[PDB]
């Protein structure tokens, strides 16, 4: 096997950012691919970690620098002179010897380019009333992303976690909802688990009928 | 640079029927009897996954409902029969010449029977209110098709310019969507009104559905 990419990044305009991808005994090529939010895929370039040889898409010649450390099977990409156009998800993908396609991808690394500062969310219950709905309002965080689980991952069926929206304050907000049997509202506890790694904050909020 | 043009940009296909996605290359992607064309698909939040390699070869772990054909510059991905789980975006890729390039993508929607939304409204929590802001949340759960009108009525007057919508991707198991509408007001503007309602119009509902609450009770 698997490709483990590093976590989401926040970087200021003009600064630089280095992303990594660790593969966990043969020749292979590590490619990097750029995907802007809700957009197409752009091939950046590849590197052979055995020789260190690289090839770049001409459009990224001055934007990206590819590096590989064969000792730990880790490939790096350095993005410099960051602008708003560089905000995207960056994927690493592996091409095996004799293949003309990608066999495995990393999970992707989100890069946000902005002068705004990191801020953790506030979490407010969406309190319910044979089917009830309850949830959590995750408000006023920056940057993306935030992860939400219910009952430490034990409750997944009926869960909808909506895409975040940028609010007038410039901070993101989302809601996570779940539909549950209305007869379990007095017996079953429903807690949302909110994780915002850029601000290193984890919040648990009980969603329950208001007093 | 070899430019790949995908068609169509989006399409809706009935469950059990055939989806046909085209990729046209500005140059031949053939070399020495081999064709350097791949198809991938991507589901929301996940990396792309290889479906077909070298124009017509199914990859391990991929159901045989996916097949690819064509050579030179014209290529086709066929999905037959389509299933709910095939909701995704599909990409062609040529690996014949540097730089490698991708098609613009095709978003596949899976049709299903009309399903009216279930509607829930959520008043702001007391602890948000104390901080000086009121968020009112309207939830539309598990509907199809995606088009829905959600209007905020506040003392029976239509609100505009102070709500934001968010919609899920098409559910990979039941092919429905879900939607949230959030009305945001300052605490002082929130206290200027008594009745907060969201009115939902949707093809599956005979008449619009209204969910409301009284501020305070």
Numbering used by the authors:
A (entry chain H): 2 to 25, 29 to 133, 140 to 221
B (entry chain L): 1 to 217
What does the paper say about this structure?
The interactions between immunoglobulin E (IgE) and its two receptors, FcεRI and CD23 (FcεRII), play pivotal roles in allergic disease. The open and closed Cε3 domain conformations involved in FcεRIα and CD23 interactions, respectively, preclude simultaneous engagement of both receptors by IgE-Fc; binding of FcεRIα and CD23 are thus regulated in an allosteric manner. We thus reveal the structural basis by which IgE-Fc binding to its two principal receptors can be selectively modulated, offering insights into an alternative therapeutic approach to the treatment of allergic disease.
To determine whether there were conformational changes in 8D6 upon binding to IgE-Fc, we solved the crystal structure of the 8D6 Fab at 2.4 Å resolution. The asymmetric unit comprises three molecules, thus providing three independent views of the uncomplexed Fab. With the exception of a 1-2 Å shift in the CDRH2 backbone, and some disorder in CDRH1 and CDRL1, the uncomplexed Fab molecules were essentially identical. However, there were significant conformational differences between unbound and complexed 8D6 Fab. To form this interaction, substantial shifts occur in the positions of Thr28, Phe29 and Asn30 (CDRH1), but the most dramatic change occurs in the Tyr27 (CDRH1) side chain, which flips from one face of the main chain to the other to contact Gln301 and Lys302 from the Cε2 domain.
